[PDB]
């Protein structure tokens, strides 16, 4: 695997997608709703992706439940992360949620979902009910549960959005700011999940914490190195934010993400810029990214035979209905 995650246009690989997936700078492919028509089509495309790379490669997606579920039709609907803690059954249900979400991606040949959201609070319009809670305990208590489900089926985990996007309650510049003099609680959540060793990966917030550092966390040496590696001893993979959203052109920016301390970089919704990176960036391997590869393998028929799937999909459906 190389460092670059990119995307494709639709339901099937084009000639150009194929030539690009064979380039050793690509490490992974991130799928969106636009790449999903139906269960069999999804399987066929993921099979075509792995085939064109002729080498291990990652297939990722943002499948959190609720406001962010790329694949809905033909899947179990997963509730907003927020709901779990509102049932008096929350830990039990969050785990089922995480297990069901993870299990079904895997059943369709996807390695990982970019989750869980470890942000605190609901006031950030963009995070909202994507968060597990408004306080450190609620959040830790329920995302640990979601985390454990993911891991039970062999799915690598990704805490986002470090060091915490849940209080970004402002908005007329290009980059979002969070001007608190301290974000100690928001970050205590990432710290504990790191210490417990339950995250394989971490996605940084594209947010400036002016009290701390001038750069957006996703592109900040302080946040990704001093804080994330040195102060917290995180040992997993570090993603960049989508490098499409100062620093220079595509290849200039990627280079900064990497120097800032990202192990991998995402370039979405801009094919020309991904290609510019493939053509001009010196080749680097990210072998430790092998750790994100899904660890189990099964089909959707085999899965739908576990009592566990039958309970979980029934229990998620009613959890959703319970809080319309």
Swiss-Prot record:
GO terms for biological process: carbohydrate metabolic process; cell division; cell wall organization; peptidoglycan biosynthetic process; peptidoglycan turnover; regulation of cell shape; response to antibiotic. The record marks 171 as: Important for catalytic activity. It comes from the Bacteria. InterPro entries: Beta_hexosaminidase_bac, Glyco_hydro_3_AS, Glyco_hydro_3_N, Glyco_hydro_3_N_sf, Glycoside_hydrolase_SF, NagZ_Beta-hexosaminidase. Substrate binds at residues 62, 70, 130, 160-161. Keywords: Antibiotic resistance, Cell cycle, Cell division, Cell shape, Cell wall biogenesis/degradation, Cytoplasm, Glycosidase, Hydrolase, Peptidoglycan synthesis. The active site is at 172 (proton donor/acceptor), 241 (nucleophile). Its EC number is 3.2.1.52. Gene3D superfamilies: Glycoside hydrolase, family 3, N-terminal domain. SUPFAM superfamilies: (Trans)glycosidases. Its main location: cytoplasm. It is found in: Cytoplasm. It is an enzyme of class 3 (hydrolase). It catalyses: Hydrolysis of terminal non-reducing N-acetyl-D-hexosamine residues in N-acetyl-beta-D-hexosaminides. Pathway: Cell wall biogenesis; peptidoglycan recycling. One of its GO terms (molecular function) is beta-N-acetylglucosaminidase activity. GO terms for cellular component: cytosol. NCBIfam families: PRK05337.1. Belongs to the glycosyl hydrolase 3 family. NagZ subfamily. PANTHER family: BETA-HEXOSAMINIDASE, BETA-HEXOSAMINIDASE-RELATED. Plays a role in peptidoglycan recycling by cleaving the terminal beta-1,4-linked N-acetylglucosamine (GlcNAc) from peptide-linked peptidoglycan fragments, giving rise to free GlcNAc, anhydro-N-acetylmuramic acid and anhydro-N-acetylmuramic acid-linked peptides. Plays a role in beta-lactam antibiotic resistance via its role in generating anhydro-N-acetylmuramic acid-linked peptides; these peptides function as signaling molecules that induce high-level expression of the beta-lactamase AmpC. Monomer. This is Beta-hexosaminidase.
């Amino acid at each position: 695997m190389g460092p670059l995650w990119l995307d494709v246009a639709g339901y099937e690989l084009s000639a150009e997608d194929r030539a690009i997936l064979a380039h050793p700078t690509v490490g992974g492919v991130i799928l969106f709703g636009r790449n999903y028509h139906d269960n069999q089509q999804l399987l066929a495309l993921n099979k075509a992706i792995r085939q064109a790379a002729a080498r291990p490669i990652l297939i990722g997606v943002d499948q959190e439940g609720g406001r962010v579920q790329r694949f809905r039709e033909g899947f179990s609907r997963i509730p907003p992360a927020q709901y779990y803690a509102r049932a008096e059954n929350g830990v039990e249900l969050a785990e089922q949620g995480g297990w069901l979400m993870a299990a079904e991606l895997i059943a369709h040949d996807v390695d990982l979902s970019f989750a869980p959201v470890l942000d605190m609070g609901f006031a950030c319009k963009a995070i909202g009910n994507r968060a597990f809670g408004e306080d450190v305990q609620t959040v830790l208590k329920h995302s640990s549960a979601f985390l454990r489900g993911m891991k039970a089926v062999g799915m690598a985990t990704t805490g986002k959005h470090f060091p915490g996007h849940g209080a970004v309650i402002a908005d007329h510049l290009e980059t979002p700011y969070d001007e608190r003099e301290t974000i100690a609680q928001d970050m205590a959540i990432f710290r504990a999940q790191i210490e417990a060793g339950v995250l394989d990966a971490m996605m940084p917030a594209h947010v400036v914490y002016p009290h701390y550092d001038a750069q957006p966390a996703s592109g900040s040496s302080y946040w990704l190195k001093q804080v994330l590696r040195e102060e917290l001893g995180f040992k997993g993979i570090v993603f960049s934010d989508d490098l499409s959203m100062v620093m220079g052109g595509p290849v200039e920016r990627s280079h900064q993400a990497l120097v800032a301390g990202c192990d991998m970089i995402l370039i979405c919704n801009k094919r020309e810029a991904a290609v510019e990176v493939l053509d001009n960036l010196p080749i680097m391997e990210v072998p430790q990214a092998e750790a994100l590869l899904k660890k189990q393998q099964f089909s959707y028929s085999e899965l739908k035979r576990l009592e566990r799937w039958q309970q979980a999909s029934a229990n998620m459906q009613r959890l959703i209905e319970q809080f319309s």
